[PDB]
Amino acid sequence: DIATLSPNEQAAIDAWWRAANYLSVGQIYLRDNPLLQEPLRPEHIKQRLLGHWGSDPGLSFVYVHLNRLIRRLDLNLIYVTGPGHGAPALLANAWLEGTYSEVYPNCQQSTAGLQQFFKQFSFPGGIGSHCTPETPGSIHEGGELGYSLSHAFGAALDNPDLIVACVIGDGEAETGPLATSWHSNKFLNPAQDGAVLPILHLNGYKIANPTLLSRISHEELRSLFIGYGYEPFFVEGNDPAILHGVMASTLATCVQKIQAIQAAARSGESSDRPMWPMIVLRTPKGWTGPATIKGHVVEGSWRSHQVPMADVLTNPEHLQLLEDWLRSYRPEELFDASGAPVAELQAIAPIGDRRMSANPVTNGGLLRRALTLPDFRDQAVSVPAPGKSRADSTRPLGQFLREVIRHNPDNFRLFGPDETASNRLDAVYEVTSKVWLGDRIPEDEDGGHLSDRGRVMEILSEHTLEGWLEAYLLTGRHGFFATYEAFAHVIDSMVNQHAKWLDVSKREVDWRAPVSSLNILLSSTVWRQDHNGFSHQDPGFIDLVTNKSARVTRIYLPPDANCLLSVADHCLRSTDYINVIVADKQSHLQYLDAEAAARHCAKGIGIWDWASNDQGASPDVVIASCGDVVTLEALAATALLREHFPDLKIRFVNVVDLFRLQPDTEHPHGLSDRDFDSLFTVDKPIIFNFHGYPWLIHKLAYRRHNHNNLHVRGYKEVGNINTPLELAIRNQVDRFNLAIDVIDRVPHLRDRGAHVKEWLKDQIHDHIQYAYQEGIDRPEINQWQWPF
Amino acid sequence: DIATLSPNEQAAIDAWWRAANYLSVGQIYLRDNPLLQEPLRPEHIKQRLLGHWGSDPGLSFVYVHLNRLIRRLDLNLIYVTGPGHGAPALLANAWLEGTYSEVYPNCQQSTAGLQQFFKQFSFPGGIGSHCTPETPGSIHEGGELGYSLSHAFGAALDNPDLIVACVIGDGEAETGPLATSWHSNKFLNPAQDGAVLPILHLNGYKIANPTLLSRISHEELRSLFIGYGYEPFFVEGNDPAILHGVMASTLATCVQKIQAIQAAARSGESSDRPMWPMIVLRTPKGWTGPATIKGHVVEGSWRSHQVPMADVLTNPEHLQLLEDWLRSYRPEELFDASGAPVAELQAIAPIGDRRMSANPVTNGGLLRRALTLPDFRDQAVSVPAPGKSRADSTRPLGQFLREVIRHNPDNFRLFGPDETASNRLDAVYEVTSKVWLGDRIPEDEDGGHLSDRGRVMEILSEHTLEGWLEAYLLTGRHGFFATYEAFAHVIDSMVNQHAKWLDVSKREVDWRAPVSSLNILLSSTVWRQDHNGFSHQDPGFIDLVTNKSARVTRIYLPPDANCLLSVADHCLRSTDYINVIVADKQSHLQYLDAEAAARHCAKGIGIWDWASNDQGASPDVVIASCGDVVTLEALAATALLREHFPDLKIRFVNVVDLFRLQPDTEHPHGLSDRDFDSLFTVDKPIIFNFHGYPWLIHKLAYRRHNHNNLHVRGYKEVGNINTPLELAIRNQVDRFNLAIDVIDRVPHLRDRGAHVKEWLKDQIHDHIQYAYQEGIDRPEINQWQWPF
Amino acid sequence: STVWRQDHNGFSHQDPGFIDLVTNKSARVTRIYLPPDANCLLSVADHCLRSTDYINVIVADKQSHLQYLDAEAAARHCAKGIGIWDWASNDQGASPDVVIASCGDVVTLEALAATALLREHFPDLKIRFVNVVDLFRLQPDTEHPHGLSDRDFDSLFTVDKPIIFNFHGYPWLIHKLAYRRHNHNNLHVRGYKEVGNINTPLELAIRNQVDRFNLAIDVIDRVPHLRDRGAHVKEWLKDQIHDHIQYAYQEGIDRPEINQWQWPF
Ligand SMILES: Nc1ncnc2c1ncn2[C@@H]1O[C@H](COP(=O)(O)OP(=O)(O)NP(=O)(O)O)[C@@H](O)[C@H]1O
Ligand SMILES: Nc1ncnc2c1ncn2[C@@H]1O[C@H](COP(=O)(O)OP(=O)(O)NP(=O)(O)O)[C@@H](O)[C@H]1O
Ligand SMILES: Nc1ncnc2c1ncn2[C@@H]1O[C@H](COP(=O)(O)OP(=O)(O)NP(=O)(O)O)[C@@H](O)[C@H]1O
Ligand SMILES: Cc1ncc(C[n+]2csc(CCOP(=O)(O)OP(=O)(O)O)c2C)c(N)n1
Ligand SMILES: Cc1ncc(C[n+]2csc(CCOP(=O)(O)OP(=O)(O)O)c2C)c(N)n1
Ligand SMILES: [Mg+2]
Ligand SMILES: [Mg+2]
Structure with a gap:
């Protein structure tokens, strides 16, 4: 009896469906007078309309049916929304289930709560038009399209009994990231992980163009989605009276197969890749809204994507059409006098954590256990x-x-x-x-x-x-x-x-x-x-x-x-x-x-004392490195300078946390001015050797007292093919260029280091010539060790 | 059958009671080996013992009985703890109920969870020894004594069905704040508010002295607590076998009277001040611990207040006594192999929000509705x-x-x-x-x-x-x-x-x-x-x-x-x-x-343009005020200066938020250096007239670039009786002293303002003489208005 | 207590x-x-x-x-x-590079331990140790006769050397008392700021930056001829802060050498 839909149950489900749409439209349009007790007036309409409508009925259409199977089969479900602009549908159901009132006591289930609920949506000081973290039961913000599908598989991992119902828009399916993420079934284990129930919301249109997946033939659609490894189920039409029963059967069919797949795998009798069930849902865009506006068809067309009527504040004709749109849901029979949904609606509302908007999985931080980390010193190499x-x-x-x-x-x-x-x-x-x-x-x-x-x-x-x-x-x-x-x-x-x-x-x-x-x-x-x-x-x-x-x-x-x-x-x-x-x-x-x-x-970040020779004295130069290859070149440059300039005092600083360079004013994590002046002095040149674009250091540390003495060498460009030393020579981050840079910057080496600087340029010439001759660096370069 | 205690139920309650004590002692002492599977060794004991023991059994004694009536009568309860040092008892029951694991997934109900649960208490990087906000189901930190009783009444307000069980130590009752808060019954409405169930934990001793309320005779104890308006119930003894049944009956008696009182009031038949039930509980201190240590009685004495044995790490003799203490709870029959409480313990554990540690009232912020604030401009006086x-x-x-x-x-x-x-x-x-x-x-x-x-x-x-x-x-x-x-x-x-x-x-x-x-x-x-x-x-x-x-x-x-x-x-x-x-x-x-x-x-904080005359020019002085009386004197001084120095340019600044003066480095709310320099210039004297001790301004605004030009006049001292103007003259915050201060500070007025400064001192002399003659200020002072 | x-x-x-x-x-x-x-x-x-x-x-x-x-x-x-402690000082017959002052008993111990650390790593550094018992001596004699004169204050705390004051209390109280002095611009007070839930005695001093290691760091920052020369010691001092905090979170107490510290020399 789970597959078939009772007419009594069909009515209550349809009652929930319209109320969710009504709250969705109210959020888009109304800022006052939530229940149409008084005639609609322009002071009740929102000045700027930012919500999207063409996807809201479809999301609520599936959502009410998903709650049906939770009440019947006690399924643990999550709702992941592909088109993030369909936020009102999720919020309306969240409010209907009662979750939103518990999380937000201001938006109660009353007339006064509805006024706050309607006025907040897509409003300054309110909430956004997408599935932001403020949304109860939301893990995925669908503003950027193509990642809803992968997030379904990610949340499914190591949650064997969880089922993640991810609704996918046909326009979103045209994006690169989502076309390839369909093959995630090959890496999902039925034995230890849950299921993903993909629902293709093939409304037929994008913002302004038809979706190709809709205009591709049904045969090629089934061919495409069996090649992804899914068993596709198709629910098509436009009349909800037929579609309520048809869709309910399809969802009943899918859940049984998902459980049958999981039952077969966890028993061990069928350890093969199963054909996961997937639903293809073809419904009109703007399904229960205006049919035509200004002689142009809107419902079931791209014209309904965001807002079917955006001049309702200007001319009263559309204003009456808007009020006529709201009354088509018959709100008088959906809410009581106080402002709560009727008891028929409360009957089919799931209870507690079984509600998709109140599932603790979505607020995963509550389900977070700190890792038992073994002591890393067992794996530390000996130095x-x-x-x-x-x-x-x-x-x-x-x-x-x-x-x-x-x-x-x-x-x-x-x-x-x-x-x-x-x-x-x-x-x-x-x-x-x-x-x-x-x-x-x-x-x-x-x-x-x-x-x-x-x-x-x-x-x-x-x-x-x-x-x-x-x-x-x-x-x-x-x-x-x-x-x-x-x-x-x-x-x-x-x-x-x-x-x-x-x-x-x-x-x-x-x-x-x-x-x-x-x-x-x-x-x-x-x-x-x-x-x-x-x-x-x-x-x-x-x-x-x-x-x-x-x-x-x-x-x-x-x-x-x-x-x-x-x-x-x-x-x-x-x-x-x-x-x-x-x-x-x-x-x-x-x-x-x-x-x-x-x-x-x-x-x-801190001084390396073994690489430094300035202990108990003021260093003539600070050599800093951030990386591992550039650290080697910085150390090799330090060795070269100490060989040719024995009196030169070099402080070697290595930085691991990049953001320590930012002052403590920006963030508490950054170093203070006193701490920064301790590592990098207030008046000595700093030769910073960075693994990356040199300006990133300047962006971070421009406010320091010694930033005028900060000289960063980093990645500039590359040739087609270079040896490790030759590539460092091209970007002037090698040991020889760094030693030259120190000579240029230290005031008492411009005159005194001229002969060494000429010798260093000779080494650059010799190693480049050897590189063009043999294709690798000299053995002494590859096997360089720290002297001293 | 609610009053009488079943032997089967008595055993499970006694089982919960010992397990709570066992976890309490484990938190005090153990840092490893939670369940005594292996012999106790010094590496399992905590180095420093900061927990308190003399009150833990009493709190757990009441707590298990409170959960009994919640399970029976479905009562909504809150636990407010008088002696805050009895934190382990609350945490142990919180862990036993399962609340702590839900809030803190690290401290699970297992052996590994118990290891984290025991090691965290009174530990660096762990949790404190009092009822800190980290404690689930806690509103009151009992570290400072005397306020637990008032917090019971405050939480009870406008919560008609709530019952707040506040346990009060006899030592705490000697404090001034708690002795007077007993009369809060007179202001608690049985019709609209809940009940407070005061339980006097008369263990007989403070830290090192006997409590007087224990050493005062029983007749005078009942006399004292009927004079407070309470119906006192006394449960006395030391043998838990008798005390389990006796105290269960007393709690059953109290709840019925509390409901009878509320039933009588809400029916309207008895609209008088009722005699609220109160429990006097006389039990030994350190009730289930060591009897004697080093020949001194510990249990039922002040020697058990914090730690009965604090040298257990030093000599193995007490170390064996400590392990003997733990085994007296018989932990083998209380926890399974995994580390969860036995199913007998789970039977008598309340469910969901009915648990006192998981009651949403204690985490009241979830129950917070923003006030419907009327527009204050309806009450604004016309200016x-x-x-x-x-x-x-x-x-x-x-x-x-x-x-x-x-x-x-x-x-x-x-x-x-x-x-x-x-x-x-x-x-x-x-x-x-x-x-x-x-x-x-x-x-x-x-x-x-x-x-x-x-x-x-x-x-x-x-x-x-x-x-x-x-x-x-x-x-x-x-x-x-x-x-x-x-x-x-x-x-x-x-x-x-x-x-x-x-x-x-x-x-x-x-x-x-x-x-x-x-x-x-x-x-x-x-x-x-x-x-x-x-x-x-x-x-x-x-x-x-x-x-x-x-x-x-x-x-x-x-x-x-x-x-x-x-x-x-x-x-x-x-x-x-x-x-x-x-x-x-x-x-x-x-x-x-x-x-x-x-x-x-x-x-x-901002410039008052009507009180200023420096628009489009650099002010010679900035006059700032913080308050209302000092604002009047600052304004009157501004009027005097403009009359005698027409060319003098004065910027008037009024500050309402005191903490805006702090730089933005300390807190984001403070003004920036640029913003502060805009209001108070970088180089002109600031005559600050503060309602309070002048050094508070210097503490807040010492880092500002113009702090060396900040001159604060505030409250210094008073005479016995002064007129409003005379009192301001004594503290040099009146209009005349402020005008003198401006003359002294403005560089181009020291020479030019000498004659005015003499006149201002004449006014001070005249008004003081009139004050000593008539007892009030002159009419022109009392009726001063802003000129111009 | x-x-x-x-x-x-x-x-x-x-x-x-x-x-x-x-x-x-x-x-x-x-x-x-x-x-x-x-x-x-x-x-x-x-x-x-x-x-x-x-x-x-x-x-x-x-x-x-x-x-x-x-x-x-x-x-x-x-x-x-208030007076100089000559046994804790090493500036006799010379101008001290820094004045370390303490007011209390726990903060006095940390101030002394910081003095011991500095003398081990900077043998040439001259430190005058001043201990304060009467708080109100810091107020100038203009406010009350009991306070020190400008000459007396300048003798204890020099006119131009940094003063690292370690106070048992809110640091601003020292600034309220001694704001008029000629060397108040060189007065740097470390005191009670805040606490955690539970701390060891050394960890609590570390949180408020009144421990021996933070005080030694503060001296390095303030002494003009140690900003360049004391960088390596300052890094070592921060390592000690890291090590003692890690031990505190591991064992729940301070190391034995901290608890049994004695004045060297
Ligand atoms: N003040 C600055 N602000 C932002 N980026 C900077 C600044 N100075 C240098 N850079 C960037 O740093 C890189 C190279 O300059 P720099 O790191 O200063 O080395 P340099 O040898 O000192 N070059 P120069 O400053 O012209 O003598 C480039 O990416 C520059 O854009
Ligand atoms: N730097 C400061 N730190 C703390 N308190 C201060 C400071 N300067 C002044 N005060 C306090 O402020 C009050 C008066 O000083 P101030 O506000 O500067 O006015 P003033 O007329 O300038 N007095 P003065 O600074 O001695 O010439 C007194 O109670 C002082 O204790
Ligand atoms: N002039 C002042 N008047 C009042 N309080 C002050 C003054 N200067 C510093 N303080 C207080 O002293 C404490 C720390 O500052 P201070 O004693 O001067 O040490 P510091 O290391 O020099 N800090 P800073 O002056 O900001 O570099 C803080 O609580 C300040 O509020
Ligand atoms: C790569 C990319 N191109 C364009 C957009 C702009 N955009 C935001 S929502 C949206 C509609 C998505 O179309 P469809 O999946 O058909 O959604 P629905 O019909 O349910 O609104 C588009 C195109 C985008 N988010 N990402
Ligand atoms: C006014 C005051 N004086 C002293 C203390 C120190 N103190 C903290 S807990 C405590 C024990 C409270 O005595 P009692 O009510 O007998 O508690 P119990 O025996 O249940 O531990 C004391 C004295 C305090 N908190 N407040
Ligand atoms: Mg579409
Ligand atoms: Mg007591």
């Missing part, structure tokens, strides 16, 4: 002498991540775009593998590292991975993203969205608990260009992240493996941040042991 | 000419408060220590009256303004009034406190406690929602000394409040009635602050109309 | 604010004494049991503490109310 030993920088991190996975079998995950092996993090493969539910071959047994139980997820689409991870954190869990720095620009749009979400959730919204940080590891830099990656890779992603703020993003550039461990250990505890860690996978020198590394990362 | 008309300053505020009460019949209240009539706020009496359930006489009909339905509360004890209001706010409601400035020092201790509570709730605790502000109106100043109040009243309370922070307290000194309205309207919307408004009740000049007043209070 | 050595009893956010309230009355009716050790406490109590028309407020701590002055030296110190 008996600083800078005299070489070890692979990322491998200790891989071993540390291995022990985190061991102690957090479900709460932690790894995400990587087919680069985990290249990034040299294979230590995690010793305890787990990579997720794969596609076809398997015996050749995968040797080094495939493929298993459905794996805690590491791999796909070449960087958009898919970022959406997977962001949803995983917002549901109250932990993760770590590792990728090349060359392709970081691909996810720049997605990072902005998540940073937006975190910043609002901290300051504006008070009831949203903190979630875990977004930890990103840019594992291959632009200085050590390996085989893969384009020639002109740029560090520009770092500039984009620092663009957001110091109070939501953190940038770490640890010099060695022990600093990488301390940084990763520190950032696996921080909550409301986007942590971007820039480290290189090549074999590098090691500088700090576990104790010294931990103190260094706690400060974020 | 056609600034400073040329006189009106009573506080009466418009009384009318505004009247309209707030009208639109907020239950959410708002007034609190005053027998000064509302004196403060001239009688406009509120037009709609409501004052609470009184004592004897009534026909003489009260004329101007008594007494009724049980009143929204204004009056009692001469300032301590109990402050406790009433703080609890009212922390339960999610609104209020306004009006009192003299002379007696503000009385509540200084209480204000510190509430400010402490707010500051932690904002920064540390994340799940506690904001509550309404604490609004205090110091309605009678020290300059206009009326009949009542001692001669040497000081403004020192203002200095005490500014000690706390600019981020939790705000000080407002509005000059006129319209500024008082804007300030009160602004502060009735702010949430997490202690707002202290200093205004005077006397007839004063009016300076700003509704529009100009609102702009002024929005800035908090 | 002071607020720095938080005992079992008492609320977490106890404040020294009562001292500020008393100083609001006058120097001619109230006296505030903060004796550093037991002998100084005896002389103060003996002196105040003879005075007639005053409110004497004596701030002392009950915990086990170091002892600094014997009966003869203690009595001379209380008679002055």
